[PDB]
């Protein structure tokens, strides 16, 4: 119902905020090297398990894709342990950021494209629990 859906959405908003804190480091890496950072340390951000909050367990950087993982003990059943991603694409004076269900990038260096995450049993936050500003499909432009 509406109380539950609100609770979940509010919790997911914290994951987005924590993931957004990594954007500047990820972009800087890309501009410095002409390719995305493979991992958190290369990007100059904290190890993933240190990027945490009340409702957020971790934030991982993998080939420039920033993926947040919800906690399990104090979040809504439907989002426990589930994930969302942020990723960027060059516009050729700046980058544009995207946010939605989890994605991956196979290589650090191709139109900056990403693909929908393929891990079997996928733990993707349901669309209804994503903010209106975080519903991009993997193929969005």
* Binding footprint of Cl ion on the chain (CB under 5 A): 71-73
| Minimum distance, C-beta of residue 66 to Cl ion, in the bound complex (Å) | 20
Residue number, 10 or 108, with CB nearest to Cl ion? 10
Distance CA(133)–CA(141), nearest Å, equals 14
Question: Of how many residues is the chain composed?
Answer: 141
Distance CA(38)–CA(26), nearest Å, equals 10
Residue number, 32 or 72, with CB nearest to Cl ion? 72
| Minimum distance, C-beta of residue 21 to Cl ion, in the bound complex (Å) | 20
Distance CA(60)–CA(29), nearest Å, equals 15
Residue number, 71 or 88, with CB nearest to Cl ion? 71
């Amino acid at each position: 119902g509406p109380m539950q859906d609100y609770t979940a959405r509010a919790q997911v908003s914290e994951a987005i905020l924590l993931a957004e804190g990594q954007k500047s480091a990820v972009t800087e890496y890309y501009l410095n090297h002409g390719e995305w950072p493979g991992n958190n340390t290369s990007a100059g951000v904290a190890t993933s398990s240190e990027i945490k909050g009340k409702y957020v367990k971790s934030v991982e950087v993998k080939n420039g894709v920033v993926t947040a993982q919800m906690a399990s003990s104090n979040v809504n059943n439907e989002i426990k342990g589930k994930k969302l991603s942020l990723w960027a694409k060059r516009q050729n004076g700046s980058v544009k950021w995207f946010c939605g269900q989890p994605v991956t990038r196979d290589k650090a260096k191709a139109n900056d494209d990403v693909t929908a995450a393929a891990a079997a049993n996928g733990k993707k936050i349901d669309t209804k629990h994503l903010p209106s500003t975080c519903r991009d499909a993997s193929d969005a432009s």
